[PDB]
Design an enzyme around this catalytic site. Sequence first.
Site, PDB file in Angstrom:
ATOM      1  N   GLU A 151       0.826  -1.204   0.000  1.00 50.77           N
ATOM      2  CA  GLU A 151       0.000   0.000   0.000  1.00 50.77           C
ATOM      3  C   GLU A 151       0.865   1.261   0.000  1.00 50.77           C
ATOM      4  OE1 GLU A 151      -2.742  -1.243  -0.792  1.00 50.77           O
ATOM      5  OE2 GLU A 151      -3.406   0.796  -1.255  1.00 50.77           O
ATOM      6  N   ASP A 152       1.725   1.354  -1.015  1.00 53.36           N
ATOM      7  CA  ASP A 152       2.526   2.551  -1.282  1.00 53.36           C
ATOM      8  C   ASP A 152       3.507   2.862  -0.155  1.00 53.36           C
ATOM      9  OD1 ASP A 152       0.657   2.883  -3.538  1.00 53.36           O
ATOM     10  OD2 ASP A 152      -0.699   3.692  -2.014  1.00 53.36           O
ATOM     11  N   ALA A 153       3.757   1.900   0.723  1.00 50.25           N
ATOM     12  CA  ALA A 153       4.776   2.064   1.745  1.00 50.25           C
ATOM     13  C   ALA A 153       6.149   1.756   1.162  1.00 50.25           C
ATOM     14  CB  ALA A 153       4.495   1.162   2.945  1.00 50.25           C
TER      15      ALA A 153
END
Lengths: 48, 65, 1098
Positions: free
Chosen positions: C725-727
């Site tokens: 999740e875009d981490a």
Amino acid sequence: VEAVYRCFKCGREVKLDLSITRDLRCPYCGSKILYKPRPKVPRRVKAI
Amino acid sequence: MIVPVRCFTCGKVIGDKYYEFKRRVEAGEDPEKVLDDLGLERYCCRRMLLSHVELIDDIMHYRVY
Amino acid sequence: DVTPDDLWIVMESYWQEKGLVRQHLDSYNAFIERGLQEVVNEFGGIKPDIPDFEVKFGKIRVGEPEFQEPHGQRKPLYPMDARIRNLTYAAPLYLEMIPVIKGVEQDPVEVRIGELPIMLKSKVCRLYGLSDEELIKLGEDPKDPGGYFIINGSERVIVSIEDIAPNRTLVEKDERQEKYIAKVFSYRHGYRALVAVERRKDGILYVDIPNVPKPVKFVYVMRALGLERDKDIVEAVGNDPEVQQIMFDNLEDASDITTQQEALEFIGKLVAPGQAREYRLKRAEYVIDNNLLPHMGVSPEDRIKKAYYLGMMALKVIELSLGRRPEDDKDHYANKRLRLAGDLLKDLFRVAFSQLVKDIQYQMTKTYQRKGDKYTFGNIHRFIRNSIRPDVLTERIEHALATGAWPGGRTGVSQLLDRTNYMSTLSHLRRVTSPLDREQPHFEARDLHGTHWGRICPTETPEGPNCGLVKNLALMAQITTAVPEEEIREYLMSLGIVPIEVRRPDPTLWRVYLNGVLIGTIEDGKALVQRIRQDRRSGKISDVINVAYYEDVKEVYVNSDDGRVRRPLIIVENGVPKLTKEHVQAVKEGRLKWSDLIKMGIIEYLDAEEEENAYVAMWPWEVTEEHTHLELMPAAILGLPASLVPYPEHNAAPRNTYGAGMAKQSLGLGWANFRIRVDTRGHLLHYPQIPLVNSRIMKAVGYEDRPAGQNFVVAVLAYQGYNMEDAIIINKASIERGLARSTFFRTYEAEEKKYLGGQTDKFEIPDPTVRGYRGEKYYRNLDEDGLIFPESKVEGKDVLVGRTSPPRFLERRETSVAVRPSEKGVVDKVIITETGDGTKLVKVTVRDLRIPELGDKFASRHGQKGVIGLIVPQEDMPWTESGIVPDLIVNPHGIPSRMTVGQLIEAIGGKVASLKGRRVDGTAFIGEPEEKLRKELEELGFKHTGREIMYDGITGKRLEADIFIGVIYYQRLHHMVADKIHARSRGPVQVLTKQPTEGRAREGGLRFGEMERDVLVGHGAAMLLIERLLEESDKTEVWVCENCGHIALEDKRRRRVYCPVCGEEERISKVEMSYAFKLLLDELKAMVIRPKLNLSER
RNA sequence: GACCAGGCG
DNA sequence: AACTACTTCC
DNA sequence: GGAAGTAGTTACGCCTGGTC
Ligand SMILES: [Zn+2]
Ligand SMILES: [Zn+2]
Ligand SMILES: [Zn+2]
């Protein structure tokens, strides 16, 4: 109280007391801005 | 600012090599050949020398006293 | 032919000769050179209530930047001292006064009317025309471009406003009453008038005037403007038979009711209701001369030209009614003129000078009356000098610049300059804003127009309410500065144009418009346009002139105004561009400059109007005989932060917008001046790096000298679900070696304020006997002077400037300055200085070292934002068969949904650049092709796909798939988790509502809004709603009289509870309610409403 | 305390 | 501004 | 029934600074 102060444009030291002297200026180049100098005391810094 | 002492990726010391690399490249030698001669084979190390900016000269002029 | 790589040299010369802030400097220099004197010429001489005395105005002069000491004299002032001592970098303004005693003029007297703030690097600043070493000696960054003001120590930048073109009429359809509407914004001396004509569904013509409360039939206005004859009106409006018939029908019912002399009276009835016929006439003629077409003039001699202009507007609206012409687009850039610093300063100075003129008139009259004529005529110089009172103008101007609220409804014109890095400052200095309200859905105004090509950046725009309404200039954009109109009018008239007075317009005759107003008529308008552009290329006509024609309606438009966004193009004639190889070589060798190329007619500046007539080619090999121009550099259509992005055409537009917007938030050495600069907040990346894949525009501009970011070794794989999740997953060893390290600067300010009566405050270590004394530990680092020693470690709530103020409790109170409760650091710099009024002022700068941790936001130039989800030791990171360990890992699941192929191409290019020892050109459309990069990577000994065989650090076996790895230029944004974390158990509350205060800076509480209330209700949690909204905000207890329902009174002195309204003592009981509801009961008991309360037993 | 501007999701 | 809905003069 | 007027709204937080 006589306090050690450093001028802005020139780096040579200037001596006066803020509480008494109404006007702050380097009496050599007429600079109104001064630096409070770094005290000559050891400083412990962690290298991380 | 000033050249990093170590490569950010693998920790190889590249602090000394930057000035030699700069002067050799300005002399007109092939940058790949210069970097190979200096011993930087991994491209992570070559990134450190190739993309560094000596910004210390441009800020040394302002003193804090 | 000429390669695009050869046109790059010309574009680089363009950016070398003229900086990036040339619009501000040009506008302000024009303002200083002619604008101030123009305003003073509008403001005629002051005439007071003196029998035989009045003063004329001489020449405005602006001196060097100087500051009047409170007890000394005017010393020279430099921008660093102006922005350190919290001064305003202004200069004395001098105006000569010519006294007219009984019709004769005496010798002039020069009096200072006020101070005018000076824009940095302009022709009056002290930094103008100074070498790099001279600017460095003055404590300034030579890279700084100026173009901004210093007001009370803060840097203010004036953002250009995208207004509608003045004095140009636009036609459009109302679509509600089937009424065609044609409106014009007439400007004169800073005042705009919205004159509109209207053809309603009944076929009658109506005219709207802003100060006339009701619309008026058009023929009435036409006759009021001096048109006595009906046939003259019909001829003037138009000669086409259909238009002739329309005007006859519109004029019969007007002449049968209102004649020439009756029209002024009829307008007067609406303008000045009442019986005063002479007053009605005066008001009608006033609103005619001033409030209708002010740009034509305010004298009765200009009434007739108002009639001609109104007839032209009516003819246009009739043509729209007949469908002979399309609707006028409001987003078309032929119809919008920017308002720059020069014109905005002109209007603000006009307002301030009006205030000063009225004040001086009042002062002169008062002083003359209250000492007669003893010395007013005995020595007129002292009489003028003592009546000046120059502080009014400077206070007005400085307040307007500091707050940003311009005269009128304009707000936010002056904004605080962004100094986060180089990109942010330059982009702010190159920004354009729209006056429309951000709340409304301006679908047509928030979208990209075809006329924005080369004038407005297509991709750089903020997200949210301001999207599309805030625009940044393209790198090739050039904004005009006005030339004197009269010379242009005279030249055009000499070219063969005959004024409309002698020759009337006809269908077979071209209508020529200069600056949006019709000037005359010519035959063969194409020949006139050709002659104009040939003359401009020959050099006898100024660059600012632009001309276009329209075969559809036979109209020739000539533009010479100010605020037109233009772009440069190479003139192509007979299939051969004017630019040749020898010109390119001369430019490269320094023999030829950009202004030279513009003067020889090689390169042309076109705005939207002239570009409408153009047929532009994009590449030199695309030029044919039908082409009129060639694009100098198609990659220059982007903005500066948008030009930071490499390979922008391989990315989706939203991701390009995200990257352009996030480029202005990165950390780096924004300015070399940061050490001695006093600023509220600042950052400093310890090791900035050049992007390995970078555009040539970034080197030409100067971004390479102030880089913001570093090149990371990035592997695209999923690792333990911590980059999900875009981490982003990052290397601990890389961080510990200096990757993405930064320092945060904060400058606290303490002033020794001088109150009335000589009650001053003192810089000192306060004794514990003073009121409001903090702990004695908080003054640990203070010196006896009252200031903290530099390089002393300071943590939260420790004081830096011990200060005590005179008592005002109902001993000296304490008002010392301490660091913010959530901020720590080391005292980098303590300066002492003197204010403008003469009080002592101290600035203390604290620096906090910010090593990256979980939650800090990282971004790439391709719009891939993310926070550090994990910090992994090097021995846990995967490694490549070549010995390469990633500095950063990104989940592959963020690649396809975003469609950022440019990031993968940039990784390939970065690896190739590192291996070659030469940086890869990543320009927008002439950069190195991806195929060449893949082939070169193949020849260097690596897989052409960029995938490499990787091993798992934890288990030691190679991964099944070949992992894509490369070098991507990541930048650390200033959204650090240390600057955002907040927690409030219990603290201060607002006095009015007893609820927790607002803000992280003041121990605020988080707002549990009504949306969260509905969320809690939907869960069925009733006691949790009580606990969250009543116990934890404002729970209180009140006494209610059961007999009346009013609020009972409790006498703490008499130890009794009773209801004053009815005098009950036994029917009194407590109730529990939020303090906000008791306050609501108070505001309801005000405005005379009785909220009687009924109580129940529970 | 309320006004403006800029950002963040 | 741009929508709706009344209201209210016509 | 018009044909204008009039009034009423236009997501939710959060952060920063600057001026009153
Ligand atoms: Zn000095
Ligand atoms: Zn390395
Ligand atoms: Zn009672």
